[PDB]
Every structure is written in structure tokens, then in C-alpha cells.
Amino acid sequence: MEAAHSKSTEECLAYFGVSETTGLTPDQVKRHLEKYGHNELPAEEGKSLWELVIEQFEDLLVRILLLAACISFVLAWFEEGEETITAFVEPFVILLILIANAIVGVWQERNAENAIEALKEYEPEMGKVYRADRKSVQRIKARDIVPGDIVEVAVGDKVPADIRILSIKSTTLRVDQSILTGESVSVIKHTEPVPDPRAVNQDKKNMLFSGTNIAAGKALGIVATTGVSTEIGKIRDQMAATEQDKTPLQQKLDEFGEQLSKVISLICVAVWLINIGHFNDPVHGGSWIRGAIYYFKIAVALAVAAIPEGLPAVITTCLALGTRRMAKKNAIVRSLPSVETLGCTSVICSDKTGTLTTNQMSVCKMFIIDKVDGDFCSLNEFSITGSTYAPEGEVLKNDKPIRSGQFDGLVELATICALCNDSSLDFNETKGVYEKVGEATETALTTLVEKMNVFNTEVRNLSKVERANACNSVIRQLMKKEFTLEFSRDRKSMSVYCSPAKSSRAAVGNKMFVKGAPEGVIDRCNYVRVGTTRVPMTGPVKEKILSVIKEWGTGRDTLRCLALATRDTPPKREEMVLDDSSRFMEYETDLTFVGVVGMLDPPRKEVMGSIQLCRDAGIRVIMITGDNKGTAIAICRRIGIFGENEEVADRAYTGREFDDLPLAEQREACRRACCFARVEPSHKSKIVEYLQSYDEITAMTGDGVNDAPALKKAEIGIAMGSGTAVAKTASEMVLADDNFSTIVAAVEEGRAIYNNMKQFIRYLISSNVGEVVCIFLTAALGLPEALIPVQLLWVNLVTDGLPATALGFNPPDLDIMDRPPRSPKEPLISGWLFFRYMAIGGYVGAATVGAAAWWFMYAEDGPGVTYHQLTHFMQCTEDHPHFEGLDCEIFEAPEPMTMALSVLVTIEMCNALNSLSENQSLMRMPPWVNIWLLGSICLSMSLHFLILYVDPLPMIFKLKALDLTQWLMVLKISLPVIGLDEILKFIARNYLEG
Ligand SMILES: CC(=O)C1=C(O)N2[C@@H](C1=O)[C@@H]1c3c[nH]c4cccc(c34)C[C@@H]1C2(C)C
């Protein structure tokens, strides 16, 4: 029964055929349990640690490398030699890296409390019911409550299901609906039905929502829905249906592996095809084995060289470091991958109150009727000073200070504000400041009467804490607050019934003090106050009052206005039913207009800036506020979302105007709008969806479970540090200070990160191209292998690892925020960066192969064979090119490889400095610009020596220390890369800018 709010208390009792006195019976209990299930949210079956890992080897590249480790194992076994001491390191290390990397990949789900699960924090363990099998209340497992039974809730309880209230035992029932919205202000319930069948939870004043708490009272209700059929459960389901897309980066990388996975394979085919000539070799000669083992060897090396094995660890470290860096700027990023996608942010929809504003309400303008006479009319406008809740400030007219007391209408105005209130001030000891106690809109009002002091009450005597509620406590004397009819969006006003304090048997004198939104209040006024006199509200004076309000709310002041009225001859206490808020407006009629107060919820001192920072960065900012369309547009201009005079006839909508437009125009409106006023519960989600259809990475703020869905959808769901728990667990980033500017700071910081990530990505992949050229060369020229996988790995993992990480601290661009949002379609390394990074590789290739062939031919300690065709043969089945030669095992000597490796390691340290900037010379951008980079380079080179001397390593890696002469040959064929890139860089700065 999900429309219980609109049905009568009797109707609900009938629907389920249950008695309010005994409740369901054990036969009804079982029958109900079998039809609706148990009252709880469905448990989660998290992915299996093995399932996750398995899915990581579901990747194409991880396979191509896996297979290799397999090709490596077969070879590692089908081999005969004394190098057996390290004949399995290769297929071992390969497989290992594959493990360590998969884990790192899976380290994106271990710890990440999600909303769909955090929602159990709100369902309680026990509930209280009245069942036919007893007279007293029994407290059963909430898990076992079903629709239709009778429950009981009292102050302190967490409502165990969606319950329709049957009767209120206490004087008034108060509920804390915070887990849904965020607002602590408890709400008042009633048992009277709510007509509208499609009423929103906020108007279902007769329902108690599962997961909420009883602030004050005791009540009895009939359970309407349970499990995933409640409000929270319905939200919990939306969550579960929300698909989560891969970050524009992941998508780009995942596609790179496809691109890479194809080439790798294509090259293993061009290799074979090149050695097809072997088809013309005597069967009775050579070897059908040395060929298969050779084609298989250079294939494995080929894969190992093409894949940047260190990338995963580098990206994961950069993002970890990147997270801590945001935290320093009060941006808690929960998802690592988010530190990346944050920079692609193209749209930011931010709530106003508290994010774009301080949420520190303050009254700074008010007016009463000065006089009415014929068509002539005059008001009495004022101004107040002090924006803090402190009772420190003053009232003044025409910038000149006046004493409020000297105005009667100001006394009344003051009386209402203090009587038709519900909050109060409180001076803090530690903080040493006055803290608001209750609604911010009210406290401001409380703070007002303390500044006005219409009764000249001597307060300068009183201490801080004493004068806090001084002037208020005084007004609370002149009248007795009988009862108060709560505020309801229905009539958007509220009132309190009062009677004079000094009065024994006086049956005349009671007054009702109304406070609410101007339109409603003012139309229920037949009289207008003028001092202490009163005269009929005439058409003119009405337009006068309304116009001053339009001004204060639509002008540069952007003030929230409250009209204040009083019912002079209120209905008799007896004739009022204080149980049907549907009658409250009626009670609040034939009113007299007393005054108007205008308060301000001031924009954060850093929003205008951050908004400008956004116009530059080409980032659209969409505000979502509670204000009306009029004040909303007005606030938008005030902070810059709109230009003072720019037309916004189609760039600002109110939830209502939005629902009127057809599903097509709504999509069109989401691409142009910048201001949403009075939005519906399901709008933020629709907004996010219509924005995503335009391929825009969206940031969406908001909290409480009503917002959870939207946040889950948006690419960057933002919660407040002071927000609900579920809001946070559903968001990608938390604002440790609730400040809009923190958002912007994070986008910039994400922009840095992506650029540096794009820097080291090219760094590494280029290193891979040089290696692939190196292998393919030593293969197309039948030369002996220059570099082997075990070496390449230590390179692409460590040597190249640290510097790539170092690049993480590369200084950001100064115009980092003065260029549009990176389209999630823009590729990584392409175009100029292809040719540019192709040549670097091709050089790196030739340079390594050359360094090998050199030692082999033009080296002293090396068996010179200049033009001896290392290509023409390696077979050595003739021994002709070395008649009196009894040694051919030098074609696998460690020296030449140690030459090839040293070249690569040196060239990469170089390119690491060439990588400080994409197109800037090291002249303008010295090496020491990035200290961490210089550090890693040393840590690497030295580590290069570690594997050349420490006995185990040098042999295991198949390397031998180099002579001070040979090393002189490395620098000779390494250092030059720095000039080559400077050239390509030069070619970009000058002949590539237009
Ligand atoms: C551009 C591109 O598609 C990719 C890549 O380029 N990479 C990863 C990848 O998916 C591969 C990968 C994922 N998980 C591991 C664990 C161990 C080793 C590897 C991987 C190799 C692949 C890597 C890191 C090069």
C-alpha cells in the first residue's frame, strides 16, 4: 500500500483488514510476510577477490604478456645450459609483474563504502508492534515487521518502516527527517490525510519514513510499505540500477591496449615473413629447432619491449600522491581514478545555501507603513548593520541612526519576530561567538529584535550571555504563547496564538502573529497597520508594498523577504482545531499587515572569483536553489553566473516550468540553463542525464539520501563535509569546507595531474618504441639479440619507473585554467606526438643496436669483425670467416648487451629531462626545475651500477661492467637525444603555432 498518505486512517485499516486495537494476527502475519518479504534491504554479494583478479586477466594486453610468460616457460625448460642458475627468472618475473599489477588494478574496490550499502546504517535492528497474540507491545526484529501491522514509536526511536500514522499519543509529534535532506529542523506530523496522490515526501505530513528518528513524542501507526518498497528502499534501487562508466582516461588506455595488442601481433608476423627466405635452406642442414626457438625468443622479447610494464604502478602512485595533494586544499577524493576525471569537469551544478553562500542569515532591511491617506501613501524603510548572529549592530533610516522604539509599527514588528519564532541565540564559551540555536531564518529574526530593542531595555549592563536573548525575553513577557500552527509550504506562512500576560478573566484581547512569504501573507490581509491605528488595505498601498519587495528581492540586494502580519480579532480558542494544518490558513485570515523584513544569505567571499576562474576554464556553472525564480536569477547575476543585463529568458527554470516542457525541450534546456529554482526530488538526476547526453563530465553537489541517486549518476558527485553519511559514500569527492571554490581548486589540480600523466605516459611509451625498434632491427638484420626481456623489464619497471613517477611533480602550466575542458574524445599520443615520439624511438632503436654492433666490430677488448657480416651468419656451421678460430660463443657475449643496455638507460635519463616540458627547451625550463626528477635519475643510474657489480645481479641480468672508454661511447651515442628533442620541440614552438 504505497498511497497510504492520501488514504484515510480508516481506509488503511480496511485495506489490510487489521484492527488498531489488536493488530494483525499470526495468520495475517505469515500471510503478509509471504507476500511482501522481510522488512530489509537486499544484501550485497561483492565481487570475489578471485573473480576480480580473474577479470583483470580479461584484458587483451595482460593476455599477450601472459602467453609470453608461457612461451618463456616452455623455452625455460626446453633449454640446455649452465645458466640454469637463472633459467627461470624470465618466465617467473614476467608472471610476477602480472600479479602485482592485477592487484594494483583491483586496489580500486577493496575499500570504498558505497551508498547502496551505507543505507543499512539507517534500518534499525528492532521495532515495536501490537499483535493479536497479546495485549502489550512486543519488540521484535525490524527485519520481521510487515505491511499492515501496528507499530509504536516514541522519542529516540528510529522508524523501522514506512508507516501511516493512526493516532498521536503525545501532544505533538516531531520527526528528524535529516537522513533524507540534511536539515536537522524536526518536522511536525498529523493524522489528517493528504489529498494529492502524487504528493512529495515533504508534504506527506502523516507518514513516518523508515530510517528517520522520533525527535519528540509518542505515536501509533499502521505500516504501509517495507523493504525496498519504502522511500529509502526506492532510493536504494535507483542506485543499484545506475551503471558506472569508465573514466575518460581508463577508456583511452583500454583502447590503447587494443591498438598496442594489434601492432605487437602484427610485428610477430612481419618478423616471420622477413625470415621466409629460410624456406630456401637445405633440409639436411641448419636446424628446424634453432629457428623455432629463435622466432619464439624474439617474439617474447618483442612483447616485453612493446608493453610498458611499469605504467600501472606509475599511474597508481601518481593518483595516490595526487589525492593527498587535493586534501591539503579540502577536497577529499574517495575514488583514485577520480583525481583524473576531475580535470575533465565541464559542468558544475552547485547548491546555493552553504556552498555558494555562507548560510549565515542576516536581516538588513525592513519597512512598515508610514501613512496612508487618499491615494497618497508612504512607507518607512530601514537598514540594519552587523551580518553576524551577534546582537551587535544598529538600526538606521536614511543612513542616519534612529531609535526603533520611537516607531509603533516597529514595536509590533519586533513583537511578532520574537513571538512568532522558534529559535534563539546562545553565546559560546570556547568559540567566544554567538551560535544560532535552530532555523537560520529565525535566528536572524531573534538577532534582529536584540538590535532593535523597541523597549529601550537597559542591556549594556548585562554580560555577553545575558544580553543574547535579553530583548527577546522581554517581549516574551508582554504575551503568552498559547500554541503555534507550524509552517507548511501549503500556505507558506506560520503563526502563534497569544494572549496578554497581565489578564485574569479577560475574554477579549488575544492576538495571532503571522509570518511568511509576502504573496500569501499579504493576500490574507484586509487591514494595514499605520502606527497603532489601522485602515483598510486599499489596492494602491498593496502595489506599493509588493513593489518594494520585488525590489529587495530582484535587485542587487538579493534579499529573502518575510511579510509580517497580525490577526487582531482572532477566532475563539474553542473554535480552532489544532490538528488539521489544512485549516491553519483559514485561521490566519482577516489579517492586518504590520511590516516586511528582508534578510541576506551572503555569497562566500571567494565565489565570484572561482566563478570567473570557471568562465575562463570554459566550465559552465549551474546553480540549484530554493529561492524563487526572481531572486534566483538575481543571485546568479550577483555572483557572476549571469551578466547584470544579459537576457536569461531561457537560461533559468523553476522545477515547475521544467516539468511543463516536453522531454525534448527539457534536454535543450539542460544545455543552456544555469539556474534552477524550486526543483523537484527527481530533477537533479534528470539534469545529470540530460547533461551526459551532451557528453559533458558533470559535477553535482548535494546531500542526504534524496540526492544520493543524482550524485551516483554524475561523473563527480560532490558531498559536503557536514553532509549525511550516505551522501558522502555516494560521492566521488567531499568538500571538507562545503565551499564552492574548493570544487574549482580541485578541477585545476586535476588539470595539472592529467597533463603530467600525459607527460610520463609519452615518456614511457616512447621508451617502448625504442626497444621494439631495437629488437625488430636485430631481427631484420640477423644480428645477435642486443637486449633481453629480463633487462627490458627492470628498465620499463624500475629504471624508467622512478623518473616517470618523478614527472608527477612537474610544474603546472600558468595558463592551465585559461583553456577549455579537455573533450573525452581527444586522444593521448597522436599527430605531432606520434612523429615526434616515433623518431625518438627510432633513434633509441638504432642507437642501441648500433652500440651492440659497435663493440662487436670497432672495440678493443672486442673481437673486431668490421664488415665481417654479423648478419650473413651467426650459424657458424662453416667457421670459414674464422679459419683458425675455435670460438663462436662471443656472439652472445655480455659486453655488447651491456653496451646496448647502458645506451638505453642513459638515453632514458636524458629524455626524462626532455620530458620536463612538452614543447619548452631546457634553456627556459632548467633540469633543477623539478628536484624530484633529478633525484630519481640518480637513484636509477646508481641502481644501474648495482646490477653491474653486486655478483648475483650482473650475471643474472647477463651484464658486465663497462670500461671508462666504453662508457665514453655510451654518452657519445646517448646525450645527442637531448639535441634531437630540442629540435622537435623547436619545430613545435615556431613552425607549429597557428
Ligand atoms: C594501454 C593499455 O590498454 C594498457 C597498458 O598499456 N597496460 C595495461 C593496459 O590495459 C596492461 C595491464 C593491466 N594490468 C596489468 C598488470 C600487469 C601488466 C600489465 C597490465 C600490462 C599492460 C600495461 C600496464 C602496459
mmCIF file of all heavy atoms in Angstrom, residues 949-980:
data_model
loop_
_atom_site.group_PDB
_atom_site.id
_atom_site.type_symbol
_atom_site.label_atom_id
_atom_site.label_comp_id
_atom_site.label_asym_id
_atom_site.label_seq_id
_atom_site.Cartn_x
_atom_site.Cartn_y
_atom_site.Cartn_z
ATOM 1 N N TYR A 949 77.725 -4.736 -10.620
ATOM 2 C CA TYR A 949 78.797 -5.175 -9.738
ATOM 3 C C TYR A 949 78.418 -6.224 -8.685
ATOM 4 O O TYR A 949 79.104 -7.245 -8.561
ATOM 5 C CB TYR A 949 79.452 -3.953 -9.084
ATOM 6 C CG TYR A 949 80.042 -2.976 -10.094
ATOM 7 C CD1 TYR A 949 79.225 -2.078 -10.796
ATOM 8 C CD2 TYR A 949 81.412 -2.955 -10.362
ATOM 9 C CE1 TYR A 949 79.765 -1.183 -11.740
ATOM 10 C CE2 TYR A 949 81.962 -2.066 -11.302
ATOM 11 C CZ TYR A 949 81.136 -1.185 -11.986
ATOM 12 O OH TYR A 949 81.681 -0.312 -12.908
ATOM 13 N N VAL A 950 77.341 -5.996 -7.935
ATOM 14 C CA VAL A 950 76.922 -6.964 -6.917
ATOM 15 C C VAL A 950 76.738 -8.359 -7.540
ATOM 16 O O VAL A 950 75.669 -8.686 -8.050
ATOM 17 C CB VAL A 950 75.608 -6.525 -6.251
ATOM 18 C CG1 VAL A 950 75.342 -7.366 -5.012
ATOM 19 C CG2 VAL A 950 75.689 -5.065 -5.893
ATOM 20 N N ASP A 951 77.805 -9.155 -7.476
ATOM 21 C CA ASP A 951 77.876 -10.517 -8.026
ATOM 22 C C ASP A 951 76.620 -11.184 -8.600
ATOM 23 O O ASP A 951 76.579 -11.512 -9.796
ATOM 24 C CB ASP A 951 78.500 -11.467 -6.992
ATOM 25 C CG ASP A 951 79.991 -11.672 -7.203
ATOM 26 O OD1 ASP A 951 80.731 -10.668 -7.292
ATOM 27 O OD2 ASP A 951 80.421 -12.843 -7.278
ATOM 28 N N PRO A 952 75.582 -11.414 -7.765
ATOM 29 C CA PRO A 952 74.373 -12.057 -8.293
ATOM 30 C C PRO A 952 73.830 -11.378 -9.550
ATOM 31 O O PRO A 952 73.805 -11.964 -10.642
ATOM 32 C CB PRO A 952 73.395 -11.964 -7.123
ATOM 33 C CG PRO A 952 74.297 -11.994 -5.923
ATOM 34 C CD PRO A 952 75.411 -11.076 -6.337
ATOM 35 N N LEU A 953 73.417 -10.127 -9.372
ATOM 36 C CA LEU A 953 72.824 -9.310 -10.419
ATOM 37 C C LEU A 953 73.523 -9.303 -11.776
ATOM 38 O O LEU A 953 72.968 -9.791 -12.770
ATOM 39 C CB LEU A 953 72.676 -7.868 -9.918
ATOM 40 C CG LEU A 953 72.048 -7.702 -8.529
ATOM 41 C CD1 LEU A 953 71.884 -6.209 -8.208
ATOM 42 C CD2 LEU A 953 70.704 -8.425 -8.484
ATOM 43 N N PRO A 954 74.750 -8.755 -11.839
ATOM 44 C CA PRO A 954 75.481 -8.698 -13.110
ATOM 45 C C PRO A 954 75.420 -9.969 -13.944
ATOM 46 O O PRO A 954 75.330 -9.907 -15.169
ATOM 47 C CB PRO A 954 76.902 -8.316 -12.685
ATOM 48 C CG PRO A 954 76.975 -8.761 -11.247
ATOM 49 C CD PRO A 954 75.629 -8.388 -10.716
ATOM 50 N N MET A 955 75.440 -11.121 -13.286
ATOM 51 C CA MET A 955 75.380 -12.379 -14.014
ATOM 52 C C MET A 955 73.936 -12.726 -14.360
ATOM 53 O O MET A 955 73.622 -13.087 -15.499
ATOM 54 C CB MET A 955 75.992 -13.507 -13.185
ATOM 55 C CG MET A 955 76.194 -14.783 -13.985
ATOM 56 S SD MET A 955 75.611 -16.244 -13.125
ATOM 57 C CE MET A 955 73.853 -15.875 -12.973
ATOM 58 N N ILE A 956 73.058 -12.614 -13.366
ATOM 59 C CA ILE A 956 71.645 -12.916 -13.562
ATOM 60 C C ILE A 956 71.066 -12.126 -14.723
ATOM 61 O O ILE A 956 70.346 -12.675 -15.563
ATOM 62 C CB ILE A 956 70.826 -12.581 -12.311
ATOM 63 C CG1 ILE A 956 71.367 -13.377 -11.119
ATOM 64 C CG2 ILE A 956 69.348 -12.873 -12.568
ATOM 65 C CD1 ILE A 956 70.619 -13.129 -9.825
ATOM 66 N N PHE A 957 71.382 -10.834 -14.759
ATOM 67 C CA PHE A 957 70.887 -9.972 -15.818
ATOM 68 C C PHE A 957 71.632 -10.163 -17.127
ATOM 69 O O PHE A 957 71.189 -9.668 -18.170
ATOM 70 C CB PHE A 957 70.938 -8.504 -15.379
ATOM 71 C CG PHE A 957 69.721 -8.071 -14.612
ATOM 72 C CD1 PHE A 957 69.811 -7.696 -13.270
ATOM 73 C CD2 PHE A 957 68.465 -8.100 -15.218
ATOM 74 C CE1 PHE A 957 68.666 -7.370 -12.537
ATOM 75 C CE2 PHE A 957 67.315 -7.777 -14.499
ATOM 76 C CZ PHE A 957 67.413 -7.409 -13.155
ATOM 77 N N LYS A 958 72.757 -10.881 -17.065
ATOM 78 C CA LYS A 958 73.575 -11.165 -18.247
ATOM 79 C C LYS A 958 74.353 -9.910 -18.680
ATOM 80 O O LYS A 958 74.476 -9.625 -19.876
ATOM 81 C CB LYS A 958 72.664 -11.653 -19.382
ATOM 82 C CG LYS A 958 73.200 -12.813 -20.181
ATOM 83 C CD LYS A 958 72.146 -13.902 -20.382
ATOM 84 C CE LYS A 958 71.745 -14.554 -19.060
ATOM 85 N NZ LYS A 958 70.869 -15.745 -19.266
ATOM 86 N N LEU A 959 74.891 -9.190 -17.692
ATOM 87 C CA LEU A 959 75.630 -7.942 -17.910
ATOM 88 C C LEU A 959 77.037 -7.923 -17.308
ATOM 89 O O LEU A 959 77.328 -8.665 -16.370
ATOM 90 C CB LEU A 959 74.844 -6.787 -17.304
ATOM 91 C CG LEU A 959 73.422 -6.609 -17.829
ATOM 92 C CD1 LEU A 959 72.636 -5.673 -16.927
ATOM 93 C CD2 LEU A 959 73.500 -6.072 -19.240
ATOM 94 N N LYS A 960 77.898 -7.054 -17.841
ATOM 95 C CA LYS A 960 79.264 -6.916 -17.337
ATOM 96 C C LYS A 960 79.683 -5.456 -17.300
ATOM 97 O O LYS A 960 79.492 -4.723 -18.274
ATOM 98 C CB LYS A 960 80.250 -7.699 -18.202
ATOM 99 C CG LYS A 960 80.068 -9.212 -18.149
ATOM 100 C CD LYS A 960 80.235 -9.781 -16.738
ATOM 101 C CE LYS A 960 80.192 -11.315 -16.747
ATOM 102 N NZ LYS A 960 81.331 -11.923 -17.504
ATOM 103 N N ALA A 961 80.261 -5.038 -16.178
ATOM 104 C CA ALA A 961 80.700 -3.658 -16.013
ATOM 105 C C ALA A 961 81.333 -3.143 -17.299
ATOM 106 O O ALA A 961 81.908 -3.915 -18.065
ATOM 107 C CB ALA A 961 81.696 -3.553 -14.857
ATOM 108 N N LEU A 962 81.203 -1.842 -17.542
ATOM 109 C CA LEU A 962 81.785 -1.228 -18.728
ATOM 110 C C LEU A 962 83.066 -0.486 -18.356
ATOM 111 O O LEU A 962 83.230 -0.046 -17.219
ATOM 112 C CB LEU A 962 80.803 -0.246 -19.370
ATOM 113 C CG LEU A 962 79.657 -0.799 -20.214
ATOM 114 C CD1 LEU A 962 78.812 0.355 -20.712
ATOM 115 C CD2 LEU A 962 80.202 -1.588 -21.385
ATOM 116 N N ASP A 963 83.970 -0.352 -19.322
ATOM 117 C CA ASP A 963 85.231 0.339 -19.103
ATOM 118 C C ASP A 963 85.046 1.832 -19.336
ATOM 119 O O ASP A 963 84.219 2.241 -20.147
ATOM 120 C CB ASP A 963 86.296 -0.212 -20.046
ATOM 121 C CG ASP A 963 87.622 0.490 -19.889
ATOM 122 O OD1 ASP A 963 88.208 0.445 -18.780
ATOM 123 O OD2 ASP A 963 88.078 1.093 -20.884
ATOM 124 N N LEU A 964 85.823 2.647 -18.631
ATOM 125 C CA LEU A 964 85.712 4.091 -18.759
ATOM 126 C C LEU A 964 85.807 4.576 -20.206
ATOM 127 O O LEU A 964 85.484 5.728 -20.506
ATOM 128 C CB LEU A 964 86.779 4.776 -17.903
ATOM 129 C CG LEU A 964 86.549 6.263 -17.619
ATOM 130 C CD1 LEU A 964 85.178 6.449 -16.991
ATOM 131 C CD2 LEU A 964 87.627 6.787 -16.685
ATOM 132 N N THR A 965 86.244 3.697 -21.103
ATOM 133 C CA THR A 965 86.375 4.054 -22.512
ATOM 134 C C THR A 965 85.068 3.756 -23.224
ATOM 135 O O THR A 965 84.594 4.540 -24.043
ATOM 136 C CB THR A 965 87.482 3.235 -23.210
ATOM 137 O OG1 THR A 965 88.717 3.386 -22.502
ATOM 138 C CG2 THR A 965 87.666 3.705 -24.655
ATOM 139 N N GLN A 966 84.508 2.598 -22.902
ATOM 140 C CA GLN A 966 83.256 2.145 -23.486
ATOM 141 C C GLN A 966 82.147 3.114 -23.067
ATOM 142 O O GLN A 966 81.371 3.576 -23.906
ATOM 143 C CB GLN A 966 82.963 0.719 -23.002
ATOM 144 C CG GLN A 966 84.227 -0.141 -22.904
ATOM 145 C CD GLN A 966 83.959 -1.597 -22.570
ATOM 146 O OE1 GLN A 966 83.496 -2.361 -23.412
ATOM 147 N NE2 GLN A 966 84.255 -1.985 -21.335
ATOM 148 N N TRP A 967 82.091 3.418 -21.767
ATOM 149 C CA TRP A 967 81.110 4.344 -21.190
ATOM 150 C C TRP A 967 81.182 5.683 -21.906
ATOM 151 O O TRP A 967 80.184 6.400 -22.019
ATOM 152 C CB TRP A 967 81.402 4.564 -19.707
ATOM 153 C CG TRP A 967 80.525 3.785 -18.775
ATOM 154 C CD1 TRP A 967 80.931 2.988 -17.746
ATOM 155 C CD2 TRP A 967 79.092 3.807 -18.726
ATOM 156 N NE1 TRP A 967 79.845 2.520 -17.055
ATOM 157 C CE2 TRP A 967 78.702 3.008 -17.631
ATOM 158 C CE3 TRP A 967 78.102 4.431 -19.496
ATOM 159 C CZ2 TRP A 967 77.360 2.811 -17.285
ATOM 160 C CZ3 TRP A 967 76.768 4.238 -19.153
ATOM 161 C CH2 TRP A 967 76.409 3.432 -18.052
ATOM 162 N N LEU A 968 82.379 6.020 -22.369
ATOM 163 C CA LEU A 968 82.600 7.252 -23.097
ATOM 164 C C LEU A 968 81.863 7.151 -24.424
ATOM 165 O O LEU A 968 81.503 8.163 -25.023
ATOM 166 C CB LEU A 968 84.089 7.441 -23.355
ATOM 167 C CG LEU A 968 84.792 8.603 -22.662
ATOM 168 C CD1 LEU A 968 84.631 8.507 -21.151
ATOM 169 C CD2 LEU A 968 86.257 8.570 -23.057
ATOM 170 N N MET A 969 81.647 5.918 -24.879
ATOM 171 C CA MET A 969 80.947 5.666 -26.137
ATOM 172 C C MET A 969 79.427 5.698 -25.924
ATOM 173 O O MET A 969 78.660 5.950 -26.862
ATOM 174 C CB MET A 969 81.371 4.309 -26.721
ATOM 175 C CG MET A 969 80.796 3.993 -28.113
ATOM 176 S SD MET A 969 81.262 5.153 -29.449
ATOM 177 C CE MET A 969 79.676 5.886 -29.867
ATOM 178 N N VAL A 970 78.987 5.435 -24.697
ATOM 179 C CA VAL A 970 77.565 5.478 -24.423
ATOM 180 C C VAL A 970 77.173 6.947 -24.523
ATOM 181 O O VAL A 970 76.412 7.322 -25.415
ATOM 182 C CB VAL A 970 77.218 4.907 -23.015
ATOM 183 C CG1 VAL A 970 75.726 5.005 -22.762
ATOM 184 C CG2 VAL A 970 77.645 3.455 -22.924
ATOM 185 N N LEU A 971 77.722 7.783 -23.641
ATOM 186 C CA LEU A 971 77.405 9.211 -23.648
ATOM 187 C C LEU A 971 77.493 9.796 -25.055
ATOM 188 O O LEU A 971 76.747 10.707 -25.412
ATOM 189 C CB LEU A 971 78.358 9.984 -22.741
ATOM 190 C CG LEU A 971 78.593 9.492 -21.314
ATOM 191 C CD1 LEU A 971 79.354 10.547 -20.539
ATOM 192 C CD2 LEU A 971 77.265 9.215 -20.643
ATOM 193 N N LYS A 972 78.420 9.271 -25.849
ATOM 194 C CA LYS A 972 78.610 9.744 -27.212
ATOM 195 C C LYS A 972 77.401 9.426 -28.076
ATOM 196 O O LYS A 972 77.055 10.181 -28.985
ATOM 197 C CB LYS A 972 79.857 9.100 -27.834
ATOM 198 C CG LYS A 972 81.201 9.595 -27.289
ATOM 199 C CD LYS A 972 82.381 8.968 -28.049
ATOM 200 C CE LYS A 972 83.750 9.491 -27.575
ATOM 201 N NZ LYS A 972 84.033 10.907 -27.975
ATOM 202 N N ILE A 973 76.762 8.301 -27.792
ATOM 203 C CA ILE A 973 75.616 7.896 -28.582
ATOM 204 C C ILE A 973 74.302 7.998 -27.819
ATOM 205 O O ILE A 973 73.267 7.516 -28.281
ATOM 206 C CB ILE A 973 75.827 6.454 -29.145
ATOM 207 C CG1 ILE A 973 74.825 6.187 -30.278
ATOM 208 C CG2 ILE A 973 75.720 5.420 -28.029
ATOM 209 C CD1 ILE A 973 75.232 5.060 -31.201
ATOM 210 N N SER A 974 74.345 8.647 -26.656
ATOM 211 C CA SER A 974 73.153 8.836 -25.828
ATOM 212 C C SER A 974 72.775 10.315 -25.703
ATOM 213 O O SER A 974 71.702 10.730 -26.152
ATOM 214 C CB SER A 974 73.376 8.235 -24.444
ATOM 215 O OG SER A 974 73.603 6.843 -24.546
ATOM 216 N N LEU A 975 73.668 11.107 -25.111
ATOM 217 C CA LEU A 975 73.452 12.544 -24.922
ATOM 218 C C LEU A 975 72.822 13.298 -26.084
ATOM 219 O O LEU A 975 72.044 14.221 -25.873
ATOM 220 C CB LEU A 975 74.761 13.221 -24.538
ATOM 221 C CG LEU A 975 75.085 13.048 -23.060
ATOM 222 C CD1 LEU A 975 74.017 13.742 -22.239
ATOM 223 C CD2 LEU A 975 75.159 11.568 -22.712
ATOM 224 N N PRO A 976 73.159 12.930 -27.327
ATOM 225 C CA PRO A 976 72.599 13.596 -28.507
ATOM 226 C C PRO A 976 71.083 13.619 -28.610
ATOM 227 O O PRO A 976 70.535 14.468 -29.293
ATOM 228 C CB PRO A 976 73.245 12.849 -29.677
ATOM 229 C CG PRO A 976 73.696 11.562 -29.062
ATOM 230 C CD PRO A 976 74.205 11.985 -27.731
ATOM 231 N N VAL A 977 70.407 12.687 -27.951
ATOM 232 C CA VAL A 977 68.938 12.666 -27.982
ATOM 233 C C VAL A 977 68.373 14.028 -27.500
ATOM 234 O O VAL A 977 67.373 14.539 -28.035
ATOM 235 C CB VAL A 977 68.379 11.512 -27.081
ATOM 236 C CG1 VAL A 977 68.590 11.829 -25.587
ATOM 237 C CG2 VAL A 977 66.922 11.278 -27.393
ATOM 238 N N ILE A 978 69.034 14.609 -26.495
ATOM 239 C CA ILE A 978 68.654 15.903 -25.933
ATOM 240 C C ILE A 978 68.612 16.993 -27.007
ATOM 241 O O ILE A 978 67.779 17.902 -26.944
ATOM 242 C CB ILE A 978 69.633 16.299 -24.800
ATOM 243 C CG1 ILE A 978 69.377 15.400 -23.580
ATOM 244 C CG2 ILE A 978 69.491 17.774 -24.471
ATOM 245 C CD1 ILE A 978 70.254 15.684 -22.358
ATOM 246 N N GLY A 979 69.502 16.901 -27.992
ATOM 247 C CA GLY A 979 69.505 17.878 -29.068
ATOM 248 C C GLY A 979 68.381 17.606 -30.061
ATOM 249 O O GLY A 979 67.750 18.522 -30.588
ATOM 250 N N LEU A 980 68.136 16.330 -30.317
ATOM 251 C CA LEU A 980 67.088 15.911 -31.234
ATOM 252 C C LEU A 980 65.710 16.378 -30.775
ATOM 253 O O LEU A 980 64.918 16.897 -31.568
ATOM 254 C CB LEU A 980 67.079 14.388 -31.349
ATOM 255 C CG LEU A 980 65.829 13.842 -32.026
ATOM 256 C CD1 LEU A 980 65.781 14.317 -33.465
ATOM 257 C CD2 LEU A 980 65.823 12.339 -31.948
#
